[PDB]
Amino acid sequence: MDIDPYKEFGATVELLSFLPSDFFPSVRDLLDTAAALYRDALESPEHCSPHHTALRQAILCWGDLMTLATWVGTNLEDPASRDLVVSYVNTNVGLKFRQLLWFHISCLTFGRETVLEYLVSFGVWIRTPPAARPPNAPILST
Amino acid sequence: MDIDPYKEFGATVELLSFLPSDFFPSVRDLLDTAAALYRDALESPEHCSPHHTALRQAILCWGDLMTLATWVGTNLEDPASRDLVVSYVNTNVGLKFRQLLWFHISCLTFGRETVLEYLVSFGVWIRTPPAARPPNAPILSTL
Numbered sequence: 001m002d003i004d005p006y007k008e009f010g011a012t013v014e015l016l017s018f019l020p021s022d023f024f025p026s027v028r029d030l031l032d033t034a035a036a037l038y039r040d041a042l043e044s045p046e047h048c049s050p051h052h053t054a055l056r057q058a059i060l061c062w063g064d065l066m067t068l069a070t071w072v073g074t075n076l077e078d079p080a081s082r083d084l085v086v087s088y089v090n091t092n093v094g095l096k097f098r099q100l101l102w103f104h105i106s107c108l109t110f111g112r113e114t115v116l117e118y119l120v121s122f123g124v125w126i127r128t129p130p131a132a133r134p135p136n137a138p139i140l141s142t
Numbered sequence: 143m144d145i146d147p148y149k150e151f152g153a154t155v156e157l158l159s160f161l162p163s164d165f166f167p168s169v170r171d172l173l174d175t176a177a178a179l180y181r182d183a184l185e186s187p188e189h190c191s192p193h194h195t196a197l198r199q200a201i202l203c204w205g206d207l208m209t210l211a212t213w214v215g216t217n218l219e220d221p222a223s224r225d226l227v228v229s230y231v232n233t234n235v236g237l238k239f240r241q242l243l244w245f246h247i248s249c250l251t252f253g254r255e256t257v258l259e260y261l262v263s264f265g266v267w268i269r270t271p272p273a274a275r276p277p278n279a280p281i282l283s284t285l
Contacts, residue, residue: 001184
């Protein structure tokens with residue numbers, strides 16, 4: 001069974017690894033932003049949007065991963081060395097959520113296509129050597 | 143940030159724990175049920191329903207979870223400590239996803255309210271004294 005988290009939103013995992021791995025904020029920063037910009041819709045009893053639905057599942061999923069990695073770090077080894085279980089999650093999967101978290105928060109703010117366009121525009125822009133690219137990078141707004 | 147997976151769907155975490163711990167299939171059974179019944183709608187570029195989108199995340203999330211919980215099985219040694227993660231997985235989250243997976247597969251199959259009513263009814267039935275309850279439990283079948 002093969003599911004692209006983005007296919008239903010008009011994008012893919014190809015399109016997101018299209019941006020450099022350091023382009024995205026941290027997972028901790030992206031969650032802080034979710035609360036700060038949307039908590040009431042996110043805690044609301046309404047669907048609101050497919051982006052809202054997806055965002056809530058993605059926030060909570062990182063919750064299911066972190067909770068599991070912390071309870072499993074505590075039960076054999078030192079709280080100073082047990083951060084290999086939480087280290088592990090930020091190496092394999094931590095990058096994946098960084099893309100996914102950002103993608104939806106961004107889509108809520110500016111509009112799905114805006115973010116889609118922004119990804120292709122900013123993507124070809126970052127690859128372009130300094131001398132060949134405009135001084136004004138693509139910008140993300142309404 | 144404090145979010146109920148079910149609130150937007152007319153349910154709550156209280157409401158699903160209304161049901162016994164053993165009533166739900168394994169996760170492994172639920173995903174194979176899902177694959178076999180829905181692979182094509184779930185793999186579609188279409189939302190279909192809020193249930194579909196929430197489901198896709200959850201199926202995919204269980205993928206990310208097993209990847210983590212198995213990697214710590216690799217880093218273990220004791221025959222009682224390797225079995226420390228799949229003790230938790232069968233207790234804390236495996237139960238959570240079993241409910242969540244089940245809630246959604248079912249809603250797609252039978253209808254949101256259908257699945258909801260069934261939860262109250264089966265819930266009150268299991269709580270109901272044997273001798274006071276009908277022999278025939280509330281039923282989950284194709285409307």
